[PDB]
Amino acid sequence: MFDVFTRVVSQADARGEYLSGSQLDALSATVAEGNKRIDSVNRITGNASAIVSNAARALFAEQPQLIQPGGNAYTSRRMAACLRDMEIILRYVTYATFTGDASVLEDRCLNGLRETYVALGVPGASVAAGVQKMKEAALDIVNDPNGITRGDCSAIVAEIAGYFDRAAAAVA
């Protein structure tokens, strides 16, 4: 995988160039955001079980066909598989947030996932709906101003939103 730093390095080596002064300044800006990034990862992780379960409950309330007999989330194992998939996706979103690069999410979670769901008959559009619900819960948690040093986390929130959107688009 790449992190935010190695992504820039990889591009530089391909051109055979030292990182320009601006590229170094950009990473210095990235470093300055570091605490907010760490806090955001910590906050999503600390609420992972709630995020998944609340999103799942809401998805099934809004899409009852999924849990009716014959529905794709019906039966304990299929329900379990579905909750597992949401937790996996959430986990990889936090990985990409941590590293500051989407490659870990793309290579190790989303690669081939649409093909798997098509083959299995998993409704990809419903998966994307679940991820959106997790996204919305997660971003509220990150932005909660209570119990933290106040500051602007909009940039980090926007990055995380993109990772969630990346996952939802891959499966739907």
Partner: protein, 162 residues
């Protein structure tokens, strides 16, 4: 590429685990180092042309046969001299990548893996490059954390060559 952040996620993923305080501490450790690394990279980059020519001359001084003997692997002609300065430039540039990345990753990926085969195939003495790397350590002018990290990468490359 070995960097603190990728290693933290790599470890957690292999265990199928969410990141925890262990991995956050890795991130903080990265954050402690990053600015010095970025500074180190700028200083090395700015003085890069001086370091390369100075390093290359140190090799020529320590192995005078390299500038006197004929052969594709030596530097008796300008063609060989340019190859040599190019190579030393590669070492220096990849080292600055390590300073940016915060780990040996770039050296491993771009330089170390396969170097033994190259030097053997093209009959290039590793000691030549050790001498250049020793010079750069002696003459890059860094201090403190920037010096420590930069030397660690330079020593890593030296150890890889011997």
């Amino acid at each position: 590429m070995k960097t603190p952040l990728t290693e933290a996620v790599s470890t957690a993923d292999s265990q199928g685990r969410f990141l925890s305080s262990t991995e956050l501490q890795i991130a903080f450790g990265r954050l402690r180092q990053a600015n010095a690394g970025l500074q180190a990279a700028k200083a090395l980059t700015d003085n890069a042309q001086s370091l390369v020519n100075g390093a290359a001359q140190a090799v020529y001084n320590k192995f005078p046969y390299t500038t006197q003997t004929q052969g594709n692997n030596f530097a008796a002609d300008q063609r060989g001299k340019d190859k040599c300065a190019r190579d030393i430039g590669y070492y220096l540039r990849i080292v600055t990548y390590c300073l940016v990345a915060g780990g040996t990753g770039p050296l491993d990926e771009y330089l170390i893996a396969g170097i033994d085969e190259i030097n053997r195939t093209f009959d290039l003495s590793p000691s030549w490059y050790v001498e250049a790397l020793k010079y750069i350590k002696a003459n890059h002018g860094l201090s403190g954390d920037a010096r420590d990290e930069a030397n660690s990468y330079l020593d890593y490359a030296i150890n890889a060559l011997s």
